[PDB]
Each structure stands twice: as C-alpha cells, then as structure tokens.
N, CA, C and O atoms as a Tripos MOL2 file, in Angstrom:
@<TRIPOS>MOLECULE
protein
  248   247    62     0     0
PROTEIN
NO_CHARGES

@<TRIPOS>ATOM
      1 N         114.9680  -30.0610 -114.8670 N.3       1 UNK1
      2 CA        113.7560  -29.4430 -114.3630 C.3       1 UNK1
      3 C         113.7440  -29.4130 -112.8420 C.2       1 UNK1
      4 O         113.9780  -30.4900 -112.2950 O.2       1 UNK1
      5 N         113.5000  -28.3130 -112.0390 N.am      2 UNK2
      6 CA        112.9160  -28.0940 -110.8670 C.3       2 UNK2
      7 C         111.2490  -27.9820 -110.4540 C.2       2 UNK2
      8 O         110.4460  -27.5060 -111.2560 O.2       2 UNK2
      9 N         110.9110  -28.3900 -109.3460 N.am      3 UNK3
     10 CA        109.3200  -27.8180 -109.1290 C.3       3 UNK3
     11 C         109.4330  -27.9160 -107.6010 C.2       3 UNK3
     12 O         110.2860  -28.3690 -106.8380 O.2       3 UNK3
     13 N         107.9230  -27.1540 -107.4090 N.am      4 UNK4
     14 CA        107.7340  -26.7000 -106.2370 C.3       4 UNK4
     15 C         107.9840  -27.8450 -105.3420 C.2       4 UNK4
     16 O         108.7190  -28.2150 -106.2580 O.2       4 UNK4
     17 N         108.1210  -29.0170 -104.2090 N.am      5 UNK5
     18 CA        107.5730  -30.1370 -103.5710 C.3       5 UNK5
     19 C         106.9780  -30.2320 -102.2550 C.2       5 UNK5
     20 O         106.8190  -31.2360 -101.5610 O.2       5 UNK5
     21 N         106.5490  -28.5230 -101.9270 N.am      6 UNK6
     22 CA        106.1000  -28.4460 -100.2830 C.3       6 UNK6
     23 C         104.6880  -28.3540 -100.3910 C.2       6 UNK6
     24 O         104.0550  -27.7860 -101.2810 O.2       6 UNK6
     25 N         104.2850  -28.9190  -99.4770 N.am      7 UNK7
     26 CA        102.5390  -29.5840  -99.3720 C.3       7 UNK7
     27 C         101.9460  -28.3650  -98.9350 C.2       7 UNK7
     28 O         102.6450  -27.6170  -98.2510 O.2       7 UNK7
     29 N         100.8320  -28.0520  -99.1980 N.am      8 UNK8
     30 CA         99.8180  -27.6010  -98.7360 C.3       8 UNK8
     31 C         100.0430  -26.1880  -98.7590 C.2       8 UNK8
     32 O         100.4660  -25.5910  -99.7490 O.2       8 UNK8
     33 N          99.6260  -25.4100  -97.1600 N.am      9 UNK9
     34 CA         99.8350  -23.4000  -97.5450 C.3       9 UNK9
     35 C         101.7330  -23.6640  -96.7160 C.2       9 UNK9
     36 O         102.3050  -22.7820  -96.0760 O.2       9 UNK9
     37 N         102.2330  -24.8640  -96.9550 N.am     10 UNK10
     38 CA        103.8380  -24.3260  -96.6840 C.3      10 UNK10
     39 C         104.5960  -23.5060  -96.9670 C.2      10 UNK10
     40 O         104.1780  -23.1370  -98.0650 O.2      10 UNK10
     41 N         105.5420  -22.8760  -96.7210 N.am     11 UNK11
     42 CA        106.2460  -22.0280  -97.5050 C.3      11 UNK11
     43 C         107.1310  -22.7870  -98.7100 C.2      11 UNK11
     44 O         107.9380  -23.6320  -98.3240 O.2      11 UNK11
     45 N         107.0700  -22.6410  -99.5340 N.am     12 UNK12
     46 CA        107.4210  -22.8710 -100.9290 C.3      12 UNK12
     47 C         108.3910  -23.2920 -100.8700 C.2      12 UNK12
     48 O         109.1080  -22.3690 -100.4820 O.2      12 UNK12
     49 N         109.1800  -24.4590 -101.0520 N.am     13 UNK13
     50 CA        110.3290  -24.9490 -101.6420 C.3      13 UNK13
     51 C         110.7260  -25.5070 -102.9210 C.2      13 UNK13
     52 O         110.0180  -25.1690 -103.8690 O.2      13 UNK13
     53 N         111.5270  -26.1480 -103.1220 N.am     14 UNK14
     54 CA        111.9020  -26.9180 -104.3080 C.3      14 UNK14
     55 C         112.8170  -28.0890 -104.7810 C.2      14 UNK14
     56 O         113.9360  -27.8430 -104.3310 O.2      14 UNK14
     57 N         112.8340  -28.9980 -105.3340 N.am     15 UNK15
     58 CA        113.7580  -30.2380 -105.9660 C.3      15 UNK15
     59 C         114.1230  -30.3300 -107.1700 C.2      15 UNK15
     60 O         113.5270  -29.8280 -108.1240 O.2      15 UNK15
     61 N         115.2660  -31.0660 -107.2210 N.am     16 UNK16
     62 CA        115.4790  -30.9320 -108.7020 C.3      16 UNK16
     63 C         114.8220  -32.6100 -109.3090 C.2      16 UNK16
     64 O         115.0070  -33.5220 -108.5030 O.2      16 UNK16
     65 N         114.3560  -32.8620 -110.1690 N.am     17 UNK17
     66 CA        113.7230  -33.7610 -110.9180 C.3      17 UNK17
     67 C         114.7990  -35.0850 -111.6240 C.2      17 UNK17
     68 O         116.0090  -34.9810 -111.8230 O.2      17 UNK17
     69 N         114.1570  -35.9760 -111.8320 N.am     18 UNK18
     70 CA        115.4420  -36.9720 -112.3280 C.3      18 UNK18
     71 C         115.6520  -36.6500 -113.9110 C.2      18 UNK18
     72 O         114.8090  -36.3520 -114.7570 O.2      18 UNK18
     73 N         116.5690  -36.7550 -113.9840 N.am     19 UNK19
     74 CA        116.7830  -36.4300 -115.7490 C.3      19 UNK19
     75 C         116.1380  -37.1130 -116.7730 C.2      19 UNK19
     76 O         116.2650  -38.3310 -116.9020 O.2      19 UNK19
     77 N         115.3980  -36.3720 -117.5760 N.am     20 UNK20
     78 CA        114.3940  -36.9090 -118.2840 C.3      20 UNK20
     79 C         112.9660  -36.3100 -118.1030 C.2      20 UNK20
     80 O         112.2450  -35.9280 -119.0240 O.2      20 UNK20
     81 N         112.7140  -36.2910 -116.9730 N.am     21 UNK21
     82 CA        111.3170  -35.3240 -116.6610 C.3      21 UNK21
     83 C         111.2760  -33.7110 -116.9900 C.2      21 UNK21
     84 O         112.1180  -32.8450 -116.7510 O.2      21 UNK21
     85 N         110.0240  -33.6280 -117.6100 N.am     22 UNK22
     86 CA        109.5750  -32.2310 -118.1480 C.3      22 UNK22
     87 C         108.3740  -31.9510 -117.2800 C.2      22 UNK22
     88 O         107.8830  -30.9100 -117.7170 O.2      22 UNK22
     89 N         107.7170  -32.3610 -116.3240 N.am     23 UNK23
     90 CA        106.4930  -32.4260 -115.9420 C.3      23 UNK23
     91 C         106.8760  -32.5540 -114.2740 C.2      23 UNK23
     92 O         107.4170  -33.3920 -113.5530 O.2      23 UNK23
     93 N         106.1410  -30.9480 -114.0830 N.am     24 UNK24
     94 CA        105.9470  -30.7210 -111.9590 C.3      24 UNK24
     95 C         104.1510  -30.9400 -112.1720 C.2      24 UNK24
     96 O         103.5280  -30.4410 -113.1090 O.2      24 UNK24
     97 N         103.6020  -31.7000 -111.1990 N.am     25 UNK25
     98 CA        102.4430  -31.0390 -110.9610 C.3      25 UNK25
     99 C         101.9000  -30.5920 -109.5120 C.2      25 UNK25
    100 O         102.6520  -30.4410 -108.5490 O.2      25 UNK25
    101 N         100.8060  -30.4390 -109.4770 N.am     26 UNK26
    102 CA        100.1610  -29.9020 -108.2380 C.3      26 UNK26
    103 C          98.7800  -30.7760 -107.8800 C.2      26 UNK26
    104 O          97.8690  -30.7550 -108.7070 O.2      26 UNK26
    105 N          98.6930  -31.2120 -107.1790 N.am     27 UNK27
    106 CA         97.3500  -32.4930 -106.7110 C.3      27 UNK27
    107 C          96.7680  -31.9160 -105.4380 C.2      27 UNK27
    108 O          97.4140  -31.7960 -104.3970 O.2      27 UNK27
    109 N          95.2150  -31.4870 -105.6310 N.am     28 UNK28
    110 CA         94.0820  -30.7240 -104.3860 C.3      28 UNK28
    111 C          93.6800  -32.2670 -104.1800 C.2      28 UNK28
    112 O          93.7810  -33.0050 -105.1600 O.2      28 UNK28
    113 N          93.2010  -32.8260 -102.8800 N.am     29 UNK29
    114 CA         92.2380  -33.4850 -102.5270 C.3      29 UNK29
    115 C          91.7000  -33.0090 -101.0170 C.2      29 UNK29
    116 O          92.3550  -32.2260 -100.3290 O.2      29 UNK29
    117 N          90.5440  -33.5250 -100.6280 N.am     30 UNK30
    118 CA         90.1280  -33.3670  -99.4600 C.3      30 UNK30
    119 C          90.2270  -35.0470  -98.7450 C.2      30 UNK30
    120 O          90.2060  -36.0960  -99.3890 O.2      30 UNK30
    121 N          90.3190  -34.9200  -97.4930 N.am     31 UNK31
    122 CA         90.1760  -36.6010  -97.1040 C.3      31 UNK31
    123 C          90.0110  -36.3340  -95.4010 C.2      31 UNK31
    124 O          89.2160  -35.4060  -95.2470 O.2      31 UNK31
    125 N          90.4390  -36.7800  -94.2750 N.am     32 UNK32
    126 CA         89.9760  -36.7950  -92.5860 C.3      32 UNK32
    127 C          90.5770  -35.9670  -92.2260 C.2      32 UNK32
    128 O          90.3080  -35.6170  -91.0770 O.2      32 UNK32
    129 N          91.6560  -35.2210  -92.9260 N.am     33 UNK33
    130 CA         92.5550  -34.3200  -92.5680 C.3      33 UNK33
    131 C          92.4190  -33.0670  -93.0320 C.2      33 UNK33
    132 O          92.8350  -32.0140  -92.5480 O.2      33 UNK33
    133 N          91.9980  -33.2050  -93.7000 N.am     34 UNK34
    134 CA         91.2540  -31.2800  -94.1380 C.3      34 UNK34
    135 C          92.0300  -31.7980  -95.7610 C.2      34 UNK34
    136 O          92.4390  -32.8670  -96.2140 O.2      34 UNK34
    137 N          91.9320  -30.2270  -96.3190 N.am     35 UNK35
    138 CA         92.2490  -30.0100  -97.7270 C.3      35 UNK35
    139 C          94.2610  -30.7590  -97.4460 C.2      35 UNK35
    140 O          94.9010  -30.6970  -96.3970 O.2      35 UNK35
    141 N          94.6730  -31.3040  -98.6420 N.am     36 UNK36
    142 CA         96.0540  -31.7300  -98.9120 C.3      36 UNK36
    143 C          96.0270  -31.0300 -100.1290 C.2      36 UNK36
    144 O          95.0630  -30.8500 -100.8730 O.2      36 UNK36
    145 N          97.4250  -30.5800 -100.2760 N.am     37 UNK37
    146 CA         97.7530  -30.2210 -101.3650 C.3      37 UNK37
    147 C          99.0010  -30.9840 -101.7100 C.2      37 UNK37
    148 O          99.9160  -30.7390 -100.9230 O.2      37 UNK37
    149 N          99.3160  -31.8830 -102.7110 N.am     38 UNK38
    150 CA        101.3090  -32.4110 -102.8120 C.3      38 UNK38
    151 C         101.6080  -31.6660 -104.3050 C.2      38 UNK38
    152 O         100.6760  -31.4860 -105.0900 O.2      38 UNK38
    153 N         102.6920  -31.3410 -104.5550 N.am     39 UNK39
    154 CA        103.2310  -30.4880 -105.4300 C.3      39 UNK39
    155 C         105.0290  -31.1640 -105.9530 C.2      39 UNK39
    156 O         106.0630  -30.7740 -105.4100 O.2      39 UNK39
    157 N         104.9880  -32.0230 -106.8910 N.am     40 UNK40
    158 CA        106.6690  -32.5550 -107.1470 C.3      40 UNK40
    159 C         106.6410  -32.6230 -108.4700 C.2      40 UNK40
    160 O         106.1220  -31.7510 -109.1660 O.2      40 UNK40
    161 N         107.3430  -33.9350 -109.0360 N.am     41 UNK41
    162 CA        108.1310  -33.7340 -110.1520 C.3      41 UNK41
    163 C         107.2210  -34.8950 -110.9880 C.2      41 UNK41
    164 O         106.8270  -35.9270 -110.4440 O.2      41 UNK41
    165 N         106.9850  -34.5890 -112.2460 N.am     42 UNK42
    166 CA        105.8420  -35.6150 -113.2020 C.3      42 UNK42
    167 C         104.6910  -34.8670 -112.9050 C.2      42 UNK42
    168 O         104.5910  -33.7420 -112.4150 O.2      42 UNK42
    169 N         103.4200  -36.0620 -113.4600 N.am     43 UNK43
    170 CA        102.0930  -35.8850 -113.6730 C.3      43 UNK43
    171 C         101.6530  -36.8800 -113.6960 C.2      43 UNK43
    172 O         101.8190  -37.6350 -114.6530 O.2      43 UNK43
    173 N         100.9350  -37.1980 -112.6140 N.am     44 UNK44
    174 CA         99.8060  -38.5240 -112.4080 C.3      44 UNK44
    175 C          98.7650  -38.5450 -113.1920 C.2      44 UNK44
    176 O          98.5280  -37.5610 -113.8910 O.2      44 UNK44
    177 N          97.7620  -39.9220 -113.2320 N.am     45 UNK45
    178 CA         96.8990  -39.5060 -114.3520 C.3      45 UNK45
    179 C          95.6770  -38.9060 -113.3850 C.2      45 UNK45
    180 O          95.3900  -39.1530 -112.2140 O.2      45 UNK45
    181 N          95.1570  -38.1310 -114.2420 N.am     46 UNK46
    182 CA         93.4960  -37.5670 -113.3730 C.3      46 UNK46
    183 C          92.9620  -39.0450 -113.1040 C.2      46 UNK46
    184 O          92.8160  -40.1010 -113.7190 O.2      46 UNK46
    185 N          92.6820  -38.3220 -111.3720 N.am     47 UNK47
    186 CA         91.5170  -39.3430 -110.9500 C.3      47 UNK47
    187 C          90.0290  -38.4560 -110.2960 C.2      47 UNK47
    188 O          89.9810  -37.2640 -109.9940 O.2      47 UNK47
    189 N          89.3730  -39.0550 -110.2470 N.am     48 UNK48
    190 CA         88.2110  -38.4540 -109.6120 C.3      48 UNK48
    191 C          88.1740  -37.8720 -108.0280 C.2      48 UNK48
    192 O          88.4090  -38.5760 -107.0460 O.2      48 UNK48
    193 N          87.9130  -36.7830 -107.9960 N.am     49 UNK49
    194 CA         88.2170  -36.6860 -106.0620 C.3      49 UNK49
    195 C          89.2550  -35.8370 -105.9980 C.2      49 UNK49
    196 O          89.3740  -35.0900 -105.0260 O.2      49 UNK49
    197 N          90.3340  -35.8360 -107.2420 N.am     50 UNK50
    198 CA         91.5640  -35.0740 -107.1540 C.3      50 UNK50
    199 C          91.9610  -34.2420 -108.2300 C.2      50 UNK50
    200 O          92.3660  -34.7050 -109.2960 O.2      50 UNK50
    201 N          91.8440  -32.8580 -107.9570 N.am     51 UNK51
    202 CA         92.0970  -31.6100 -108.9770 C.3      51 UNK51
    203 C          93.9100  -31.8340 -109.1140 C.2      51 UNK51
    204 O          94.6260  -32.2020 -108.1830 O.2      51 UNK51
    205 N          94.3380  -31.5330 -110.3950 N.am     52 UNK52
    206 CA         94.9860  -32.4560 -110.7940 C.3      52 UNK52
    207 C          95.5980  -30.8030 -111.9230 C.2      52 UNK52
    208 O          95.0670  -30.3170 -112.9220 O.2      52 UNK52
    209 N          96.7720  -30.4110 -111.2250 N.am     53 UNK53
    210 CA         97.9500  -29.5710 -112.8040 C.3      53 UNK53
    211 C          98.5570  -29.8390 -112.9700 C.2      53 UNK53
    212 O          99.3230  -30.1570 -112.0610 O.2      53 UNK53
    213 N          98.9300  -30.0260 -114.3530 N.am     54 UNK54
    214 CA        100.2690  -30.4280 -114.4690 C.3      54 UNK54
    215 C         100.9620  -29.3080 -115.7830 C.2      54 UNK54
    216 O         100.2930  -29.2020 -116.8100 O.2      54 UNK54
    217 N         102.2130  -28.5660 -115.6800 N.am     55 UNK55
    218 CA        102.5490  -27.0820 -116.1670 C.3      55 UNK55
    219 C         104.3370  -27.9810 -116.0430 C.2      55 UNK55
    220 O         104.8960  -28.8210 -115.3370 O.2      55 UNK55
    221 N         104.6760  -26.9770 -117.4180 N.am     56 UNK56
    222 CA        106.0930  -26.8770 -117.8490 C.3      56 UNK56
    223 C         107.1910  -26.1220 -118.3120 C.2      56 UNK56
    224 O         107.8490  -26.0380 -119.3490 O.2      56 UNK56
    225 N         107.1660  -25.5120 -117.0090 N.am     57 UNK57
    226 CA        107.8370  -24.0560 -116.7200 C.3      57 UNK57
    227 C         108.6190  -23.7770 -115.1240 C.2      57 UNK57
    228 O         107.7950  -23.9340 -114.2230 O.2      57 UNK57
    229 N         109.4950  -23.5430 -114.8040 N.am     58 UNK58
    230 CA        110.4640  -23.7880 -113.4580 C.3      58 UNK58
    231 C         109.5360  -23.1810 -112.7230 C.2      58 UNK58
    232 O         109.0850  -22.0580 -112.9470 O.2      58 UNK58
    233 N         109.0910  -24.2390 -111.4270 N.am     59 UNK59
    234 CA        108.2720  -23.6550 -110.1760 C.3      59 UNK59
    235 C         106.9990  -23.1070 -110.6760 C.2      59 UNK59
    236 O         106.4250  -22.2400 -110.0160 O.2      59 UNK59
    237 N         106.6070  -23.4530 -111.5650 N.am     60 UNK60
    238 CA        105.0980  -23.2590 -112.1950 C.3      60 UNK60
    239 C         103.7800  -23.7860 -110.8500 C.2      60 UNK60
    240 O         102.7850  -23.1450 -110.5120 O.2      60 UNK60
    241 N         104.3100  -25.2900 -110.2710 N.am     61 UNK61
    242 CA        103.2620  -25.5910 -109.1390 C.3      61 UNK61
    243 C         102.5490  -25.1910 -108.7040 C.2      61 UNK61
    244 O         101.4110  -25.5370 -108.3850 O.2      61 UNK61
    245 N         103.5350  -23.7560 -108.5450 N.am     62 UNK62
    246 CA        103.2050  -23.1030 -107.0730 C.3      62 UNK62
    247 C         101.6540  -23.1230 -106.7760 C.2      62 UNK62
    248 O         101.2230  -22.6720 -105.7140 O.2      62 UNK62
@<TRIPOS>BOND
     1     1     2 1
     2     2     3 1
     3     3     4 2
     4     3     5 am
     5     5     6 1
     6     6     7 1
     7     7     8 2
     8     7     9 am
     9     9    10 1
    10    10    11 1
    11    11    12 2
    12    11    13 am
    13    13    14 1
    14    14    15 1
    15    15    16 2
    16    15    17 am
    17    17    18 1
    18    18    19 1
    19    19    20 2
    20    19    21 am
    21    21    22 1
    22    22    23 1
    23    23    24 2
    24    23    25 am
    25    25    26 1
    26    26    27 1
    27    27    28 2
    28    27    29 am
    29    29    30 1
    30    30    31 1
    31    31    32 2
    32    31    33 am
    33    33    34 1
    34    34    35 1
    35    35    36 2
    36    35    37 am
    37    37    38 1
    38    38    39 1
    39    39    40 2
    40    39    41 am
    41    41    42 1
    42    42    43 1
    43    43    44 2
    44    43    45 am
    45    45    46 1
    46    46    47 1
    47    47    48 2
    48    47    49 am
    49    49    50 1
    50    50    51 1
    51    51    52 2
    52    51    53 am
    53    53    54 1
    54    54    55 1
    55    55    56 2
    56    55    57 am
    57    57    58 1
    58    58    59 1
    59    59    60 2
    60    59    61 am
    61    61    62 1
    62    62    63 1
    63    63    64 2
    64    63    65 am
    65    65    66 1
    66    66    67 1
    67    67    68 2
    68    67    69 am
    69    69    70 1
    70    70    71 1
    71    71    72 2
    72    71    73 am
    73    73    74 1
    74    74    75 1
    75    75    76 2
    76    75    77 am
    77    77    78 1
    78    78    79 1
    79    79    80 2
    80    79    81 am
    81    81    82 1
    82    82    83 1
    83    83    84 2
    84    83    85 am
    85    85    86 1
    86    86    87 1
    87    87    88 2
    88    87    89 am
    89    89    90 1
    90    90    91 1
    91    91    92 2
    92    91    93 am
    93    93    94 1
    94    94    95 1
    95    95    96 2
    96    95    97 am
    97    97    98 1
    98    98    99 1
    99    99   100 2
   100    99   101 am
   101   101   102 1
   102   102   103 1
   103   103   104 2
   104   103   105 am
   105   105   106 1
   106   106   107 1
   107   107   108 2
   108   107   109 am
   109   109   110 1
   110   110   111 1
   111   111   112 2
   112   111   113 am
   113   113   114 1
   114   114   115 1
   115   115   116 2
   116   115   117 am
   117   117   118 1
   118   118   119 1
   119   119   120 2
   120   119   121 am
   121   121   122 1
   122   122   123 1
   123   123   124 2
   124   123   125 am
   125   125   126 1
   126   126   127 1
   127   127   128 2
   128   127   129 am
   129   129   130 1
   130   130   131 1
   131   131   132 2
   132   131   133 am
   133   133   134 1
   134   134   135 1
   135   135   136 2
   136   135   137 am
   137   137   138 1
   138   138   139 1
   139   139   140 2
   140   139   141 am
   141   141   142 1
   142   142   143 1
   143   143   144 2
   144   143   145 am
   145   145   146 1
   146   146   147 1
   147   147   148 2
   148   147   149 am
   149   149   150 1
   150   150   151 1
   151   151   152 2
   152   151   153 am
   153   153   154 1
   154   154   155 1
   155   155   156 2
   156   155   157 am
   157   157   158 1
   158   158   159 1
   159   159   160 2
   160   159   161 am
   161   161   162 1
   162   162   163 1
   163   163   164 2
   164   163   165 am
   165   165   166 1
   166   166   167 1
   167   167   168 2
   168   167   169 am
   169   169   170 1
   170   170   171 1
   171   171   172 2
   172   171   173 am
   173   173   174 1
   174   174   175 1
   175   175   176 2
   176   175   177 am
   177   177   178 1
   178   178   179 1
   179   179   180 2
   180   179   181 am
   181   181   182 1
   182   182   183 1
   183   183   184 2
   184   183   185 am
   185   185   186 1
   186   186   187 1
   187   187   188 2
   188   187   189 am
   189   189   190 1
   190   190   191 1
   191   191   192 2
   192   191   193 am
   193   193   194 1
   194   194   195 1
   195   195   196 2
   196   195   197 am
   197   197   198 1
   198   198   199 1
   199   199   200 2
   200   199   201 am
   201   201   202 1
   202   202   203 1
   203   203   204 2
   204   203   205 am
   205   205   206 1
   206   206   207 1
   207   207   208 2
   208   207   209 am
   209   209   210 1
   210   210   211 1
   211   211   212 2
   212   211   213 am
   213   213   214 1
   214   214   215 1
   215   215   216 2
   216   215   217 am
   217   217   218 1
   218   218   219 1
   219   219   220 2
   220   219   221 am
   221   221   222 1
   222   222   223 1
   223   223   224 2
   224   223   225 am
   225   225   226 1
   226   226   227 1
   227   227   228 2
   228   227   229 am
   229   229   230 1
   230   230   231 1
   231   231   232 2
   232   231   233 am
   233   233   234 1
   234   234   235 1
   235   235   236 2
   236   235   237 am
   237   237   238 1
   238   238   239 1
   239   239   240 2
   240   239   241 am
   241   241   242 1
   242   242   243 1
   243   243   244 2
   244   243   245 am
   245   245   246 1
   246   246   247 1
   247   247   248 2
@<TRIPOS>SUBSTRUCTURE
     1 UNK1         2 RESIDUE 1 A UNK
     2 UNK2         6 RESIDUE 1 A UNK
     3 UNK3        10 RESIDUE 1 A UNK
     4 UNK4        14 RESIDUE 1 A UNK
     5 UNK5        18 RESIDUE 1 A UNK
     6 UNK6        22 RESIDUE 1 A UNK
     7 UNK7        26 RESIDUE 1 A UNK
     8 UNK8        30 RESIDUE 1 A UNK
     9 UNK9        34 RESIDUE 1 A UNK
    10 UNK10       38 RESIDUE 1 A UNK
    11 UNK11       42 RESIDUE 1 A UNK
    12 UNK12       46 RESIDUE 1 A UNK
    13 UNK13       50 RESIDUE 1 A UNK
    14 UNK14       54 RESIDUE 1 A UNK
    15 UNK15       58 RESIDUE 1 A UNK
    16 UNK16       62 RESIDUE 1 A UNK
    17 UNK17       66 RESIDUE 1 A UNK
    18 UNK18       70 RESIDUE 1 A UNK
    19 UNK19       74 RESIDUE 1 A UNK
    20 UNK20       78 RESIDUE 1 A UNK
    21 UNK21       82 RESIDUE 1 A UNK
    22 UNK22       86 RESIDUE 1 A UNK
    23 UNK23       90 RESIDUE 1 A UNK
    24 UNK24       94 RESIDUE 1 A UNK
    25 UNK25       98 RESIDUE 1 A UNK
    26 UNK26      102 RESIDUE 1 A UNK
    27 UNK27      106 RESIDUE 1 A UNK
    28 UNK28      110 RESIDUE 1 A UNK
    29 UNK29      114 RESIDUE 1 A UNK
    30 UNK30      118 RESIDUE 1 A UNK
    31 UNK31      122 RESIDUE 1 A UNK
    32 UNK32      126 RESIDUE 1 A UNK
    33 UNK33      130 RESIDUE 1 A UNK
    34 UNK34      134 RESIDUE 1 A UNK
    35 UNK35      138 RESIDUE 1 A UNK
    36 UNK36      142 RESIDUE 1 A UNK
    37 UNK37      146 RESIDUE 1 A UNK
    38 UNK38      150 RESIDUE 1 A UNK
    39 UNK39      154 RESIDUE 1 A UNK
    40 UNK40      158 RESIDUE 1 A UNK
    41 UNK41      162 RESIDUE 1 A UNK
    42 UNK42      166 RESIDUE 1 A UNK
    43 UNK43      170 RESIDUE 1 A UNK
    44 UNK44      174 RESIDUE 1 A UNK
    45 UNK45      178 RESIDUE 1 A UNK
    46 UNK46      182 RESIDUE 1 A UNK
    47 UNK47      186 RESIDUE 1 A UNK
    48 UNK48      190 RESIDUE 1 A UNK
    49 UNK49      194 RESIDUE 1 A UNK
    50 UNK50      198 RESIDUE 1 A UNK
    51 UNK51      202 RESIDUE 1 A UNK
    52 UNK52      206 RESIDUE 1 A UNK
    53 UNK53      210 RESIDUE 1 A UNK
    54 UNK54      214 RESIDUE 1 A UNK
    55 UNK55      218 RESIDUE 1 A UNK
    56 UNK56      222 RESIDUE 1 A UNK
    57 UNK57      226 RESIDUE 1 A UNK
    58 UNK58      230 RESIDUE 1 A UNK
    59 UNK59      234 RESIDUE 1 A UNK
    60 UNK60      238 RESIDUE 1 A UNK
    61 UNK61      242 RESIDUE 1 A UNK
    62 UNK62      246 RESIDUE 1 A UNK
C-alpha cells in the first residue's frame, strides 16, 4: 500500500507503507497554528477535536 503523507494544502506526495498495512488516513485539526492537516499510512482511533478518514484505495487521502 501507498498513501498520500504531505500535510496540509502541500503539493501531494507519497510513501510506501510497511507490509501488512491496508489503511492511509487523513487527520483535520485546528490548534495555535491555524488548520493542520497529516495524511500517512494506518488509522488512528477517532478522537474528539479531530476529523478523522480513513479509505482503502492507492492515494485515496488526498
């Protein structure tokens, strides 16, 4: 598996995942720094505060 891993309005890149992972996601929060966006390989669990995708399909992140 590959997924997106560039933060925020970056221009789009990508990594390859450790073997075994099926899961890129995409994580919105706000915090002192304005909106963050991080985008890699897995799926954290939902927390509160943080919009939270997780998709299983090459470069789906985006």
């Amino acid at each position: 598996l590959e997924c997106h891993n560039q933060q925020s309005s970056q221009p789009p890149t990508t990594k390859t995942c450790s073997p075994g992972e099926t899961n890129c996601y995409k994580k919105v929060w706000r915090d002192h720094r304005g909106t963050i966006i991080e985008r890699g390989c897995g799926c954290p669990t939902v927390k509160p505060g943080i919009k939270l995708n997780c998709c299983t399909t090459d470069k789906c992140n985006n």
